[PDB]
Symmetry: C4
Subunit: 217 residues, 4 copies
């Protein structure tokens, strides 16, 4: 019976049939947005949702027995399981994030399609040469998130009153979004030397980011 | 057949068309001034009717001379569509067409071969990005769904609609007011909103850098 | 008698002394910012300023006769000449812009110092391969500045009421600064399809900028 | 007994022991943030702080005599020394900034870890080929900070009323953050040709940044 199932799984019709349910339930998940649509075809949708998430469990089961241990060493296969299991976590009795993360079952399209795999693998190959840099940045953020908290968190609780709130504000300053008019110009109305903290932080952070972009080449 | 071919391929012919381009280009840019259009309104719309008439003749001649070679030249197809657009009556129809008359000034890139190379150099890059662009669009689509059914209830203006989420997420991609404008307000209601957007901005930026590196290398 | 002046001009003390006055009047121009300073040492500065423009008038004369036609064919010399001539325009009579552009005489440090010339020339060397691009962008902006004017200049005069006014706003959209919350989101409350105009405009403009960066890196 | 200290210092446990205390007081320094935490283990922390900074004094002492002058020629060692010396400055005497700069002793992890040194040295190595440009950038800012001050600092003191205020605003304009809606659009409502000042300033500043990136590329 194994060889019987093995032929169905690895057939091109099988893979194509899975892509069919993705693009369908992908559309099906995207019309659950419209409250108007949900009045007419609300029942049509949730069933097909349960239908598709059920079939993908079957498909992911066959891929196991066909590949055995080879299945649970394939990231694209493990992804599917978690991403199907998320969709399998009960519809109710819990935070709606799980019902939302059910839409992650639409990322399953990159698994079924090999052309996307090449795009994805090409990018992840860059991550190795960047952990040397990312780690340094995180220590830099952590050291300065400490300083900003015990510097400005007294008069500015919403931006720096908490080690975490300082982290959030500092990432925004990195992105440069309202760093001056939004945060530093007001900060300077109380601490006039605040620019000594943030201008070099922007200098340093930008220089490193540029090096990382150049590092990739 | 040979009679028209000499007129069409004469260098004055090419030069004469560029003259009307730079003329109607100026002429189209003076239709901006309400002052100018009160005195010389007739002189211009006639000159527009004059120019659109000559360009119809010009676009006719190049057809019979090249036959299928005309409708296989992208630079020629552009001219045809963009002149045909301008031919829809000035008042009959949505006034949008009267605006799209200004697209006939891009025909200068067609008429000039030096521009053709610059434009072709950039469009030639798009192929190596459709493999990537498509992935980006899928990423946007999955998150536009999540953001919609997460924040669209209390925030209809930004996420109440699958389309509105797309706009906001492209805005967040551009980093414009993403924090003080969008996420900070969301966090006043959903304190874990930063878990949604900080990794999103990471992914969006990471792919953009990879796209730049691909073009540079 | 001619060759006598030629030795002084190209002497290293001469070259160094001008830089001495550059960094001097450069500092002197930067204390004219302080209203406090200008009450006590106003004469000390404007005189030293008048002193500097006098010596720099002399120096720019000497370099001419020594170089003859080579002076008015050396951009760095023409620059000096124009930038000192600006400083030579009378202190009064005329727009104060000239008194401000007198501070351009501090750019004279880039001419006098040769190491900067290479740094500057390294940047200008990039300009040739980009005029092919800059020109297209200007045509791209001009076509869209027209549309924005005759699209939104009716209900939105301060952003698009004028072909020039449209140029400014569109340049802002290029920088992505407040393009959405500032311009497109308000426009959409009046013209709901405004995003069809500005979202791709950003795409093309950004795409071209990226290619330009890649072009320079190669 | 010169060789006696050298073996302990050069032991891998010695290097590892310092790295352990870095990551420890690093956590401890980040728990001094919570006002809640400081009520329970506040004393436990301030004691542990004095403990750690005392041990790091010992370590920085041993490495000296073992290395003699070689210690004060090692940047990574000088850093450790200076950054520990800060923590030795009295806890309450002087501005509380000193109590904050105690957290810089967590950058000593980049020193203590050799894998980081290569990354950091790789980045600092880029800075030399940029001082040719960085200096030019600084002069450009300096010349324009003066002009903006005596142009817009009169009606707009908060952004340009002071040579320093102009510098900050110009760096703000450089970062492009609210450069248009925040600074130039208000400026133009009073000085309508203010855009002639800032649009090319942005062009040059933006153009140089790419060249700086290209400098990093080449
Ligand atoms: C699976 C693979 C991808 C399939 C893409 C399917 C797109 C689903 C579109 C659902 C939709 O348009 O909902 C309409 C909403 C609600 O309006 P409503 O008035 O509530 O009814 O209101 C709107 O959002 C109006 C929609 C206007 C056009 C939006 C087109 C976006 C298509 C996304 C393309 C993604 C390609 C990867
Ligand atoms: C020397 C190198 C190794 C250092 C690694 C140590 C990482 C953690 C050290 C101490 C950080 C946690 C202590 C802390 O200040 O957290 C409490 C703050 C203050 O708020 P608090 O007054 O305590 O009220 C509770 C607020 N709540 C619910 C958000 C927790 O509330 C918060 O903000 C909680 C969030 C703190 C988590 C910080 C995560 C940064 C880790 C960076 C290290 C790299 C990780 C890859
Ligand atoms: O822990 C750090 C915080 C903790 O969350 P927390 O800020 O306490 O919660 C914020 C909720 N709020 C604002 C409404 C109170 O969580 C954060 O919000 C941290 C924000 C993420 C910034 C981390 C950036 C890593 C630095 C390097 C990034 C890689 C690119 C080079
Ligand atoms: C630089 C780090 C950020 C910053 O400027 O603040 C730390 C100090 C400024 O202290 P300070 O300017 O004395 O602020 C005291 C104002 N007060 C009494 C009303 C709270 O910075 C300095 O003391 C310098
Ligand atoms: O569908 C996308 C929407 C639909 O159009 P529409 O529903 O009319 O606009 C949203 C509603 N509004 C006017 C209130 C904002 O129209 C949009 O908002 C389009 C905005 C950009 C779409 C984001 C897709 C970008 C993919 C990322 C590719 C990166 C390559 C550089
Ligand atoms: C837990 C978690 O991660 O989600 C928490 C947030 C808060 O949602 P929620 O408690 O419903 O917001 C307050 C609404 N109210 C006043 C009616 C109760 O629920 C969210 O929707 C936050 C979304 C976080 C994005 C994670 C991906
Ligand atoms: C490659 C880089 C992109 C290439 C194109 C550069 C983008 C445009 C930059 C030129 C500056 C610009 O945005 O246009 C300004 C001028 C003056 O028009 P104008 O209507 O007088 O603006 C001032 C009126 N006001 C104060 C109420 C705003 O508008 C004009 O009249 C034409 C612009 C003159 C230079 C082109
Ligand atoms: C991405 C960086 C590109 C290259 C750097 C660009 C050139 C650097 C010039 C920008 C300097 C930062 C602007 C600034 O904050 O100037 C402030 C100080 C004096 O201000 P001050 O009046 O004392 O502060 C009170 C006024 N307030 C409250 C409104 C700020 O003004 C000064 O004290 C003069 C400081 C001159 C800066 C020295 C040049 C350092 C170049 C750093 C290179 C960065 C490497 C990527």
């Amino acid at each position: 019976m194994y060889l019987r199932i093995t032929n169905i799984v690895e057939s091109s019709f099988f893979t194509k049939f899975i892509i069919y349910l993705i693009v369908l339930n992908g559309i099906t998940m995207g019309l659950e947005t419209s409250k108007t649509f949900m009045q007419s075809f609300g029942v049509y949708t949730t069933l097909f949702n349960q239908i598709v998430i059920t079939i993908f469990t079957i498909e992911i089961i066959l891929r196991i027995y066909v590949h055995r241990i080879s299945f649970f060493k394939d990231p694209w296969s493990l992804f599917d399981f978690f991403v199907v299991a998320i969709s399998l976590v009960p519809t109710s009795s819990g935070f709606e994030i799980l019902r939302v993360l059910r839409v992650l079952r639409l990322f399953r399209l990159v698994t079924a399609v090999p052309q996307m795999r090449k795009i994805v693998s090409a990018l992840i190959s860059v991550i190795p040469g960047m952990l040397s840099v990312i780690a340094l940045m995180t220590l830099f953020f952590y050291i300065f998130a400490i300083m900003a908290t015990q510097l400005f968190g007294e008069r500015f609780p919403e931006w720096f009153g908490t080690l975490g709130e300082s982290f959030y504000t500092l990432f925004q300053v990195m992105t440069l979004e309202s760093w001056s008019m939004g945060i530093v110009r007001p900060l300077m109305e109380v601490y006039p030397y605040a620019w000594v903290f943030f201008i070099p932080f922007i200098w340093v952070v930008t220089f490193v980011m540029i090096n990382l972009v150049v590092a990739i080449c």
